[PDB]
Nucleic acid binder design. Structure first.
Lengths: 77, 76, 77, 76
DNA sequence: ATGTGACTTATAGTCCGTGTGATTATAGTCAACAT
DNA sequence: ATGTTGACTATAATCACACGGACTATAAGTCACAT
């Protein structure tokens, strides 16, 4: 569907695994539904900047380093 | 409101201006509503990635250039 | 399958709803997985007395009270 | 160990005796292993409902009578 | 008769994830009128 | 030109649940040898 979305959803998962988190921890720490974290990674889903922020806080990661990894993923072949 | 959401909006407005675009024209170029655009720039909207993407295409700016800028703006 | 199991299964759910609990709450307080609580109610799984005991403690109900409702459900038409 | 588990077992042993059965015979009647039964009666086993059901069949006691008894036993 | 121990094998119970209908909050989109 | 106020309607986001596969702990079932 959307170019950027699958990149965002890819990076959320990448970080989540890097930090040895599971989906449902992240769902807690991000103060969003269990199934939403799944749905974001699983398919992609069209999240909101506010929701993205919540997830970033949950990944225990800064806006900045998130976007830095986002850029790197976009740039790949 | 949100810090990120504010910086996003600021960035959208910044790029629109360094390109000498009007809102009217930013909305024409991305096929969204001008009041919608207005709203974002006065930070009254919490856009989705999809929408953000349409706005980048309307600004004629790559995702990467946008985020490069968004990062810099984020750091005061 | 087993006669007693689906009865035990039924009564666990009945109580759980009577107390306005959700599976999530229950598996919570029973310190079992929410998958297992679902599994039990769903497909009448074959639990252990120890696990049943945990569920009773989770339902905030006593041995006695449970077995009294168990007897009732068995007796029904 | 568990409180319930001990009284299940106690009950199983109680009924086997009130009937005059040996373990050997409770095992035969319920098509289970004798050492299996001995284990339960010394309370070294944590039955599943299914197993309990087989032991009730062997004792020839309905679920209801078993639980009526277990309750009474439970209340000291 | 019953009670051990110790040793496989079935399965109970765990852990992480997928996929889904139904409801609620809210973004997406477009009016009217402002300046 | 841009701002703001309501609106309607799509959909983001929530909530309670089912379902699967893979792995770990342990109950199920059977030996040998006590007594």
């Amino acid at each position: 569907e959307s170019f950027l979305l699958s990149k965002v959803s890819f990076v959320i998962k990448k970080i989540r695994l890097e930090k040895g988190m599971t989906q449902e921890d992240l769902a807690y720490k991000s103060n969003l539904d269990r199934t939403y974290i799944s749905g974001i990674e699983r398919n992609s889903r069209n999240l909101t900047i506010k929701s993205l922020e919540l997830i970033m806080k949950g990944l225990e990661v800064s806006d900045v380093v998130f976007f830095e990894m986002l850029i790197k993923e976009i740039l790949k072949h």
